Amino acid sequence: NFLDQLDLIIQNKHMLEHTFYVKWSKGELTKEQLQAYAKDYYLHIKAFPKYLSAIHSRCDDLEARKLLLDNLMDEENGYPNHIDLWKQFVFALGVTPEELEAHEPSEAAKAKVATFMRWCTGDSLAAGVAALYSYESQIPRIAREKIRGLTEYFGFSNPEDYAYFTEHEEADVRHAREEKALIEMLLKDDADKVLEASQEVTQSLYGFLDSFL
Amino acid sequence: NFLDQLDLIIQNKHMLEHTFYVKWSKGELTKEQLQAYAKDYYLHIKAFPKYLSAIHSRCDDLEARKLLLDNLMDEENGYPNHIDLWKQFVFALGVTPEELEAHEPSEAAKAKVATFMRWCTGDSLAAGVAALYSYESQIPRIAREKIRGLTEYFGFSNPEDYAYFTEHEEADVRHAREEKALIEMLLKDDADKVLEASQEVTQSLYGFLDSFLD
Ligand SMILES: [Fe+3]
Ligand SMILES: [Fe+3]
Ligand SMILES: [Fe+3]
Ligand SMILES: [Fe+3]
């Protein structure tokens, strides 16, 4: 039951039903909105590995830490890592490296990131993972929608320009599954806390997308 | 200068000069003291990866996080990992798995671990790494001293029984160097904090070894 409630919260407040992606899917965003979005996502992208180490650092379940480590490796080890790939996507949108490093994250991005961190630094490890799950579980569907739109409306005829999304179509299937497993492995009579994180994260993500309209 | 001061603190309060290792090196510990020590280290061994993620999770320097990740991977990814290898050592001492899982960490072990964590969860990332450096920088020398003693006085004729130490002879050479680099990369006018962590950790380690001469 609680896993299902969790997934339902997400489905009922999924990012592909936000006006920003409804527009995306009909090709109704300007290049500027696209470049703004990409730049403003960068704070979250850089933070993501910290969301994971934050939970790892509070966790004494050895098997859970291994799984958290597996995710953290996928995000951050090697070259190109997920941050690198995101930077490529931004560059392929015509934003320069300098412009990317100079962008001041919007208040809406700072609030989204702080929402994630608040849960990953809190007393419930399971709720920490649910916060992350509530985002990662959406990315497989979003990534392939984003590819469809980049291709059909924004002229991305070269697949290496959307490598981040090609990566995430697949990678996050794995991460969602292992986060689900982590939630039941770490649960300690805090299923309510898991549910609350999901409500709070999904809303935050809506607050974030609101800011480009 | 401050890196030298750091290393001097460690040298002047190094674990091999604690009475517990002076005894070790002359073969003057009982098997019981040896099994006790090994069991009581386990809390720290399991905590170690958390020390590293704790700093990682507070760090926005991308290059520093990669290095922290590198250390974390070495400690905890794969099989056998460092925790697995330590379990093997304990088992090779004649302690059973059940006995290992049943050991209540001593108050001295809990204090050592809390000292490390306090620094790794604090406001200075550089001081966090220095806390870990103040331990890991000692392990190459200790590991080979421990091997020598296991071999010469405790009958370890089969090298797989001290794989943890064989691992650490080498691994921690790398980790010490990269922690050194991390400390200068993360420094923010908190060289004083770096020095204070080392004083505090070295002492805590002394407090921990003291507890087996009771
Ligand atoms: Fe990713
Ligand atoms: Fe992911
Ligand atoms: Fe190790
Ligand atoms: Fe190490």
PDB file of all heavy atoms in Angstrom, chain A residues 49-60 64-65 68 116-117 119-122 124-132 182 186, chain B residues 50 53 57:
ATOM      1  N   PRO A  49      24.566  14.615  -6.165  1.00  0.00           N
ATOM      2  CA  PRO A  49      25.458  13.698  -5.476  1.00  0.00           C
ATOM      3  C   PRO A  49      25.552  13.959  -3.985  1.00  0.00           C
ATOM      4  O   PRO A  49      25.681  12.992  -3.209  1.00  0.00           O
ATOM      5  CB  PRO A  49      26.809  13.946  -6.147  1.00  0.00           C
ATOM      6  CG  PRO A  49      26.458  14.388  -7.535  1.00  0.00           C
ATOM      7  CD  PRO A  49      25.272  15.338  -7.234  1.00  0.00           C
ATOM      8  N   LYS A  50      25.426  15.218  -3.567  1.00  0.00           N
ATOM      9  CA  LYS A  50      25.350  15.520  -2.141  1.00  0.00           C
ATOM     10  C   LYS A  50      24.060  14.985  -1.496  1.00  0.00           C
ATOM     11  O   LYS A  50      24.092  14.591  -0.313  1.00  0.00           O
ATOM     12  CB  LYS A  50      25.418  17.028  -1.855  1.00  0.00           C
ATOM     13  CG  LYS A  50      26.567  17.772  -2.465  1.00  0.00           C
ATOM     14  CD  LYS A  50      26.776  19.168  -1.870  1.00  0.00           C
ATOM     15  CE  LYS A  50      25.652  20.131  -2.102  1.00  0.00           C
ATOM     16  NZ  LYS A  50      25.907  21.432  -1.321  1.00  0.00           N
ATOM     17  N   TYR A  51      22.923  15.006  -2.211  1.00  0.00           N
ATOM     18  CA  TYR A  51      21.701  14.402  -1.630  1.00  0.00           C
ATOM     19  C   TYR A  51      22.004  12.966  -1.192  1.00  0.00           C
ATOM     20  O   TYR A  51      21.635  12.571  -0.074  1.00  0.00           O
ATOM     21  CB  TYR A  51      20.540  14.346  -2.587  1.00  0.00           C
ATOM     22  CG  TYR A  51      20.116  15.660  -3.162  1.00  0.00           C
ATOM     23  CD1 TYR A  51      19.553  15.709  -4.413  1.00  0.00           C
ATOM     24  CD2 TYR A  51      20.272  16.852  -2.477  1.00  0.00           C
ATOM     25  CE1 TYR A  51      19.155  16.894  -4.978  1.00  0.00           C
ATOM     26  CE2 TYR A  51      19.854  18.041  -3.036  1.00  0.00           C
ATOM     27  CZ  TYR A  51      19.284  18.067  -4.284  1.00  0.00           C
ATOM     28  OH  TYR A  51      18.898  19.239  -4.891  1.00  0.00           O
ATOM     29  N   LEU A  52      22.727  12.230  -2.047  1.00  0.00           N
ATOM     30  CA  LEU A  52      23.033  10.804  -1.802  1.00  0.00           C
ATOM     31  C   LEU A  52      24.054  10.557  -0.684  1.00  0.00           C
ATOM     32  O   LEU A  52      23.858   9.691   0.161  1.00  0.00           O
ATOM     33  CB  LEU A  52      23.509  10.155  -3.116  1.00  0.00           C
ATOM     34  CG  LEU A  52      22.419  10.001  -4.199  1.00  0.00           C
ATOM     35  CD1 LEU A  52      22.978   9.801  -5.572  1.00  0.00           C
ATOM     36  CD2 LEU A  52      21.556   8.828  -3.867  1.00  0.00           C
ATOM     37  N   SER A  53      25.146  11.319  -0.670  1.00  0.00           N
ATOM     38  CA  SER A  53      26.120  11.202   0.398  1.00  0.00           C
ATOM     39  C   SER A  53      25.542  11.676   1.689  1.00  0.00           C
ATOM     40  O   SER A  53      25.852  11.141   2.727  1.00  0.00           O
ATOM     41  CB  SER A  53      27.422  11.936   0.080  1.00  0.00           C
ATOM     42  OG  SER A  53      27.265  13.305  -0.211  1.00  0.00           O
ATOM     43  N   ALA A  54      24.644  12.632   1.637  1.00  0.00           N
ATOM     44  CA  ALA A  54      23.964  13.051   2.876  1.00  0.00           C
ATOM     45  C   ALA A  54      23.232  11.875   3.588  1.00  0.00           C
ATOM     46  O   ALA A  54      23.315  11.705   4.775  1.00  0.00           O
ATOM     47  CB  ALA A  54      22.987  14.203   2.566  1.00  0.00           C
ATOM     48  N   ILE A  55      22.554  11.040   2.828  1.00  0.00           N
ATOM     49  CA  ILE A  55      21.849   9.888   3.396  1.00  0.00           C
ATOM     50  C   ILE A  55      22.890   8.828   3.775  1.00  0.00           C
ATOM     51  O   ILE A  55      22.879   8.255   4.851  1.00  0.00           O
ATOM     52  CB  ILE A  55      20.878   9.331   2.338  1.00  0.00           C
ATOM     53  CG1 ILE A  55      19.879  10.398   1.962  1.00  0.00           C
ATOM     54  CG2 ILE A  55      20.166   8.119   2.853  1.00  0.00           C
ATOM     55  CD1 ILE A  55      19.016  10.008   0.800  1.00  0.00           C
ATOM     56  N   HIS A  56      23.827   8.587   2.888  1.00  0.00           N
ATOM     57  CA  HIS A  56      24.860   7.582   3.161  1.00  0.00           C
ATOM     58  C   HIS A  56      25.521   7.897   4.495  1.00  0.00           C
ATOM     59  O   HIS A  56      25.679   7.029   5.295  1.00  0.00           O
ATOM     60  CB  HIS A  56      25.866   7.608   2.022  1.00  0.00           C
ATOM     61  CG  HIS A  56      26.968   6.618   2.141  1.00  0.00           C
ATOM     62  ND1 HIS A  56      28.084   6.828   2.925  1.00  0.00           N
ATOM     63  CD2 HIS A  56      27.154   5.426   1.530  1.00  0.00           C
ATOM     64  CE1 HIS A  56      28.896   5.799   2.794  1.00  0.00           C
ATOM     65  NE2 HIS A  56      28.360   4.938   1.946  1.00  0.00           N
ATOM     66  N   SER A  57      25.847   9.169   4.737  1.00  0.00           N
ATOM     67  CA  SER A  57      26.561   9.559   5.936  1.00  0.00           C
ATOM     68  C   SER A  57      25.731   9.404   7.231  1.00  0.00           C
ATOM     69  O   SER A  57      26.286   9.523   8.304  1.00  0.00           O
ATOM     70  CB  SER A  57      27.051  11.002   5.818  1.00  0.00           C
ATOM     71  OG  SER A  57      25.959  11.904   5.940  1.00  0.00           O
ATOM     72  N   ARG A  58      24.424   9.168   7.114  1.00  0.00           N
ATOM     73  CA  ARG A  58      23.553   9.026   8.285  1.00  0.00           C
ATOM     74  C   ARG A  58      23.075   7.598   8.453  1.00  0.00           C
ATOM     75  O   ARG A  58      22.312   7.311   9.348  1.00  0.00           O
ATOM     76  CB  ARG A  58      22.348   9.958   8.183  1.00  0.00           C
ATOM     77  CG  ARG A  58      22.708  11.437   8.412  1.00  0.00           C
ATOM     78  CD  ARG A  58      21.652  12.425   7.896  1.00  0.00           C
ATOM     79  NE  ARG A  58      22.027  13.802   8.211  1.00  0.00           N
ATOM     80  CZ  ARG A  58      22.826  14.570   7.468  1.00  0.00           C
ATOM     81  NH1 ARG A  58      23.345  14.115   6.324  1.00  0.00           N
ATOM     82  NH2 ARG A  58      23.081  15.830   7.859  1.00  0.00           N
ATOM     83  N   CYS A  59      23.602   6.699   7.653  1.00  0.00           N
ATOM     84  CA  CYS A  59      23.055   5.379   7.553  1.00  0.00           C
ATOM     85  C   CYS A  59      24.036   4.341   8.071  1.00  0.00           C
ATOM     86  O   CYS A  59      25.186   4.344   7.658  1.00  0.00           O
ATOM     87  CB  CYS A  59      22.736   5.123   6.096  1.00  0.00           C
ATOM     88  SG  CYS A  59      22.047   3.509   5.741  1.00  0.00           S
ATOM     89  N   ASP A  60      23.581   3.456   8.957  1.00  0.00           N
ATOM     90  CA  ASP A  60      24.415   2.364   9.489  1.00  0.00           C
ATOM     91  C   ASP A  60      24.044   1.022   8.912  1.00  0.00           C
ATOM     92  O   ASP A  60      24.655   0.034   9.286  1.00  0.00           O
ATOM     93  CB  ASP A  60      24.304   2.246  11.004  1.00  0.00           C
ATOM     94  CG  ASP A  60      24.813   3.464  11.739  1.00  0.00           C
ATOM     95  OD1 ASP A  60      25.907   3.982  11.414  1.00  0.00           O
ATOM     96  OD2 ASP A  60      24.158   3.950  12.676  1.00  0.00           O
ATOM     97  N   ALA A  64      22.376  -1.006   2.619  1.00  0.00           N
ATOM     98  CA  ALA A  64      21.778   0.182   2.064  1.00  0.00           C
ATOM     99  C   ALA A  64      22.858   1.130   1.557  1.00  0.00           C
ATOM    100  O   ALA A  64      22.687   1.758   0.483  1.00  0.00           O
ATOM    101  CB  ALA A  64      20.932   0.868   3.105  1.00  0.00           C
ATOM    102  N   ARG A  65      23.955   1.240   2.318  1.00  0.00           N
ATOM    103  CA  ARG A  65      25.025   2.159   1.931  1.00  0.00           C
ATOM    104  C   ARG A  65      25.620   1.734   0.616  1.00  0.00           C
ATOM    105  O   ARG A  65      25.981   2.578  -0.181  1.00  0.00           O
ATOM    106  CB  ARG A  65      26.119   2.227   2.983  1.00  0.00           C
ATOM    107  CG  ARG A  65      25.678   2.878   4.274  1.00  0.00           C
ATOM    108  CD  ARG A  65      26.720   3.758   4.882  1.00  0.00           C
ATOM    109  NE  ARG A  65      27.984   3.069   5.068  1.00  0.00           N
ATOM    110  CZ  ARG A  65      28.513   2.678   6.237  1.00  0.00           C
ATOM    111  NH1 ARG A  65      27.920   2.881   7.388  1.00  0.00           N
ATOM    112  NH2 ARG A  65      29.676   2.045   6.236  1.00  0.00           N
ATOM    113  N   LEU A  68      23.369   2.977  -1.946  1.00  0.00           N
ATOM    114  CA  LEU A  68      23.506   4.420  -2.124  1.00  0.00           C
ATOM    115  C   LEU A  68      24.804   4.760  -2.876  1.00  0.00           C
ATOM    116  O   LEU A  68      24.831   5.667  -3.709  1.00  0.00           O
ATOM    117  CB  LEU A  68      23.470   5.140  -0.803  1.00  0.00           C
ATOM    118  CG  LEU A  68      22.076   5.178  -0.226  1.00  0.00           C
ATOM    119  CD1 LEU A  68      22.198   5.404   1.270  1.00  0.00           C
ATOM    120  CD2 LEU A  68      21.252   6.244  -0.854  1.00  0.00           C
ATOM    121  N   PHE A 116      14.985  19.190  -1.244  1.00  0.00           N
ATOM    122  CA  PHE A 116      15.674  17.908  -1.260  1.00  0.00           C
ATOM    123  C   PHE A 116      16.604  17.748  -0.076  1.00  0.00           C
ATOM    124  O   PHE A 116      16.616  16.708   0.555  1.00  0.00           O
ATOM    125  CB  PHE A 116      16.480  17.723  -2.527  1.00  0.00           C
ATOM    126  CG  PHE A 116      15.655  17.419  -3.718  1.00  0.00           C
ATOM    127  CD1 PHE A 116      15.323  18.413  -4.624  1.00  0.00           C
ATOM    128  CD2 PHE A 116      15.204  16.140  -3.950  1.00  0.00           C
ATOM    129  CE1 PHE A 116      14.549  18.140  -5.747  1.00  0.00           C
ATOM    130  CE2 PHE A 116      14.442  15.858  -5.079  1.00  0.00           C
ATOM    131  CZ  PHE A 116      14.123  16.872  -5.972  1.00  0.00           C
ATOM    132  N   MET A 117      17.383  18.782   0.249  1.00  0.00           N
ATOM    133  CA  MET A 117      18.433  18.620   1.265  1.00  0.00           C
ATOM    134  C   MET A 117      17.832  18.468   2.629  1.00  0.00           C
ATOM    135  O   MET A 117      18.335  17.751   3.501  1.00  0.00           O
ATOM    136  CB  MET A 117      19.377  19.822   1.287  1.00  0.00           C
ATOM    137  CG  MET A 117      20.724  19.517   2.023  1.00  0.00           C
ATOM    138  SD  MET A 117      21.709  17.969   1.183  1.00  0.00           S
ATOM    139  CE  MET A 117      22.610  18.938  -0.152  1.00  0.00           C
ATOM    140  N   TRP A 119      15.137  16.974   3.412  1.00  0.00           N
ATOM    141  CA  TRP A 119      14.774  15.574   3.607  1.00  0.00           C
ATOM    142  C   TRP A 119      15.961  14.635   3.710  1.00  0.00           C
ATOM    143  O   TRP A 119      15.960  13.744   4.536  1.00  0.00           O
ATOM    144  CB  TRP A 119      13.821  15.099   2.528  1.00  0.00           C
ATOM    145  CG  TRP A 119      12.490  15.658   2.718  1.00  0.00           C
ATOM    146  CD1 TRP A 119      11.917  16.643   2.009  1.00  0.00           C
ATOM    147  CD2 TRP A 119      11.545  15.253   3.707  1.00  0.00           C
ATOM    148  NE1 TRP A 119      10.674  16.917   2.509  1.00  0.00           N
ATOM    149  CE2 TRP A 119      10.411  16.064   3.549  1.00  0.00           C
ATOM    150  CE3 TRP A 119      11.553  14.290   4.730  1.00  0.00           C
ATOM    151  CZ2 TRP A 119       9.275  15.946   4.359  1.00  0.00           C
ATOM    152  CZ3 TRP A 119      10.430  14.164   5.545  1.00  0.00           C
ATOM    153  CH2 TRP A 119       9.308  15.006   5.364  1.00  0.00           C
ATOM    154  N   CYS A 120      16.984  14.842   2.897  1.00  0.00           N
ATOM    155  CA  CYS A 120      18.171  13.985   2.954  1.00  0.00           C
ATOM    156  C   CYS A 120      19.016  14.227   4.198  1.00  0.00           C
ATOM    157  O   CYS A 120      19.752  13.349   4.567  1.00  0.00           O
ATOM    158  CB  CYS A 120      19.024  14.164   1.720  1.00  0.00           C
ATOM    159  SG  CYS A 120      18.158  13.720   0.228  1.00  0.00           S
ATOM    160  N   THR A 121      18.928  15.383   4.830  1.00  0.00           N
ATOM    161  CA  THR A 121      19.616  15.612   6.122  1.00  0.00           C
ATOM    162  C   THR A 121      18.726  15.388   7.341  1.00  0.00           C
ATOM    163  O   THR A 121      19.173  15.643   8.457  1.00  0.00           O
ATOM    164  CB  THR A 121      20.146  17.071   6.241  1.00  0.00           C
ATOM    165  OG1 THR A 121      19.080  17.994   6.011  1.00  0.00           O
ATOM    166  CG2 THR A 121      21.110  17.394   5.167  1.00  0.00           C
ATOM    167  N   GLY A 122      17.478  14.935   7.154  1.00  0.00           N
ATOM    168  CA  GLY A 122      16.506  14.804   8.274  1.00  0.00           C
ATOM    169  C   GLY A 122      16.585  13.492   9.050  1.00  0.00           C
ATOM    170  O   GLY A 122      17.470  12.676   8.807  1.00  0.00           O
ATOM    171  N   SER A 124      14.537  10.912   8.952  1.00  0.00           N
ATOM    172  CA  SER A 124      14.106   9.676   8.302  1.00  0.00           C
ATOM    173  C   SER A 124      14.953   9.390   7.071  1.00  0.00           C
ATOM    174  O   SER A 124      14.916  10.152   6.112  1.00  0.00           O
ATOM    175  CB  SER A 124      12.620   9.705   7.952  1.00  0.00           C
ATOM    176  OG  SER A 124      12.327   8.632   7.057  1.00  0.00           O
ATOM    177  N   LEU A 125      15.729   8.316   7.100  1.00  0.00           N
ATOM    178  CA  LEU A 125      16.504   7.928   5.906  1.00  0.00           C
ATOM    179  C   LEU A 125      15.560   7.512   4.785  1.00  0.00           C
ATOM    180  O   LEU A 125      15.778   7.844   3.650  1.00  0.00           O
ATOM    181  CB  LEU A 125      17.456   6.784   6.239  1.00  0.00           C
ATOM    182  CG  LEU A 125      18.474   7.098   7.378  1.00  0.00           C
ATOM    183  CD1 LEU A 125      19.131   5.823   7.785  1.00  0.00           C
ATOM    184  CD2 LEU A 125      19.517   8.094   6.957  1.00  0.00           C
ATOM    185  N   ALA A 126      14.477   6.816   5.131  1.00  0.00           N
ATOM    186  CA  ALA A 126      13.559   6.349   4.122  1.00  0.00           C
ATOM    187  C   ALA A 126      12.878   7.507   3.401  1.00  0.00           C
ATOM    188  O   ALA A 126      12.662   7.474   2.188  1.00  0.00           O
ATOM    189  CB  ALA A 126      12.548   5.474   4.748  1.00  0.00           C
ATOM    190  N   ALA A 127      12.494   8.507   4.170  1.00  0.00           N
ATOM    191  CA  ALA A 127      11.921   9.705   3.602  1.00  0.00           C
ATOM    192  C   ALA A 127      12.951  10.479   2.733  1.00  0.00           C
ATOM    193  O   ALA A 127      12.581  11.133   1.736  1.00  0.00           O
ATOM    194  CB  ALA A 127      11.391  10.613   4.734  1.00  0.00           C
ATOM    195  N   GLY A 128      14.221  10.457   3.160  1.00  0.00           N
ATOM    196  CA  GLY A 128      15.307  11.022   2.368  1.00  0.00           C
ATOM    197  C   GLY A 128      15.327  10.396   0.979  1.00  0.00           C
ATOM    198  O   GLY A 128      15.366  11.070  -0.016  1.00  0.00           O
ATOM    199  N   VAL A 129      15.253   9.080   0.911  1.00  0.00           N
ATOM    200  CA  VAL A 129      15.295   8.393  -0.375  1.00  0.00           C
ATOM    201  C   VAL A 129      14.023   8.637  -1.167  1.00  0.00           C
ATOM    202  O   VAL A 129      14.074   8.774  -2.371  1.00  0.00           O
ATOM    203  CB  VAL A 129      15.466   6.882  -0.203  1.00  0.00           C
ATOM    204  CG1 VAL A 129      15.531   6.232  -1.564  1.00  0.00           C
ATOM    205  CG2 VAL A 129      16.732   6.592   0.603  1.00  0.00           C
ATOM    206  N   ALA A 130      12.892   8.682  -0.486  1.00  0.00           N
ATOM    207  CA  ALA A 130      11.614   8.995  -1.129  1.00  0.00           C
ATOM    208  C   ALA A 130      11.643  10.382  -1.773  1.00  0.00           C
ATOM    209  O   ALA A 130      11.087  10.625  -2.852  1.00  0.00           O
ATOM    210  CB  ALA A 130      10.568   8.939  -0.133  1.00  0.00           C
ATOM    211  N   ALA A 131      12.338  11.313  -1.142  1.00  0.00           N
ATOM    212  CA  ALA A 131      12.455  12.610  -1.752  1.00  0.00           C
ATOM    213  C   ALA A 131      13.145  12.494  -3.085  1.00  0.00           C
ATOM    214  O   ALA A 131      12.694  13.092  -4.064  1.00  0.00           O
ATOM    215  CB  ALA A 131      13.218  13.516  -0.877  1.00  0.00           C
ATOM    216  N   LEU A 132      14.264  11.752  -3.102  1.00  0.00           N
ATOM    217  CA  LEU A 132      14.998  11.534  -4.342  1.00  0.00           C
ATOM    218  C   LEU A 132      14.203  10.696  -5.326  1.00  0.00           C
ATOM    219  O   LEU A 132      14.238  10.965  -6.533  1.00  0.00           O
ATOM    220  CB  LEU A 132      16.337  10.869  -4.106  1.00  0.00           C
ATOM    221  CG  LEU A 132      17.254  11.529  -3.104  1.00  0.00           C
ATOM    222  CD1 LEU A 132      18.546  10.703  -3.078  1.00  0.00           C
ATOM    223  CD2 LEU A 132      17.514  12.967  -3.440  1.00  0.00           C
ATOM    224  N   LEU A 182      15.520   0.669  -1.268  1.00  0.00           N
ATOM    225  CA  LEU A 182      16.049   1.392  -0.116  1.00  0.00           C
ATOM    226  C   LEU A 182      14.948   1.859   0.839  1.00  0.00           C
ATOM    227  O   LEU A 182      15.036   1.661   2.043  1.00  0.00           O
ATOM    228  CB  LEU A 182      16.881   2.577  -0.599  1.00  0.00           C
ATOM    229  CG  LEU A 182      18.291   2.183  -1.026  1.00  0.00           C
ATOM    230  CD1 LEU A 182      18.818   3.263  -1.951  1.00  0.00           C
ATOM    231  CD2 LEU A 182      19.184   2.033   0.170  1.00  0.00           C
ATOM    232  N   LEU A 186      14.949   0.748   4.679  1.00  0.00           N
ATOM    233  CA  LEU A 186      15.304   1.735   5.686  1.00  0.00           C
ATOM    234  C   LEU A 186      14.107   2.156   6.509  1.00  0.00           C
ATOM    235  O   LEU A 186      14.244   2.895   7.479  1.00  0.00           O
ATOM    236  CB  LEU A 186      15.861   2.994   4.988  1.00  0.00           C
ATOM    237  CG  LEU A 186      17.258   3.132   4.386  1.00  0.00           C
ATOM    238  CD1 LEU A 186      18.296   3.364   5.418  1.00  0.00           C
ATOM    239  CD2 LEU A 186      17.611   1.922   3.675  1.00  0.00           C
TER     240      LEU A 186
ATOM    241  N   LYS B  50      31.271   6.701   6.237  1.00  0.00           N
ATOM    242  CA  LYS B  50      30.427   7.799   6.614  1.00  0.00           C
ATOM    243  C   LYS B  50      31.240   9.024   6.885  1.00  0.00           C
ATOM    244  O   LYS B  50      30.747  10.105   6.640  1.00  0.00           O
ATOM    245  CB  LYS B  50      29.580   7.514   7.865  1.00  0.00           C
ATOM    246  CG  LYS B  50      28.670   6.253   7.819  1.00  0.00           C
ATOM    247  CD  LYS B  50      27.604   6.219   8.908  1.00  0.00           C
ATOM    248  CE  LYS B  50      28.163   6.209  10.316  1.00  0.00           C
ATOM    249  NZ  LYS B  50      27.045   6.408  11.283  1.00  0.00           N
ATOM    250  N   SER B  53      31.573  10.403   3.243  1.00  0.00           N
ATOM    251  CA  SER B  53      30.340  10.932   2.656  1.00  0.00           C
ATOM    252  C   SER B  53      29.875  12.168   3.399  1.00  0.00           C
ATOM    253  O   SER B  53      29.345  13.120   2.815  1.00  0.00           O
ATOM    254  CB  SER B  53      29.221   9.871   2.559  1.00  0.00           C
ATOM    255  OG  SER B  53      28.837   9.324   3.807  1.00  0.00           O
ATOM    256  N   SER B  57      29.097  15.363   1.325  1.00  0.00           N
ATOM    257  CA  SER B  57      27.764  15.945   1.308  1.00  0.00           C
ATOM    258  C   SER B  57      27.730  17.407   1.677  1.00  0.00           C
ATOM    259  O   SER B  57      26.692  18.010   1.537  1.00  0.00           O
ATOM    260  CB  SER B  57      26.824  15.192   2.259  1.00  0.00           C
ATOM    261  OG  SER B  57      27.074  15.480   3.644  1.00  0.00           O
TER     262      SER B  57
END
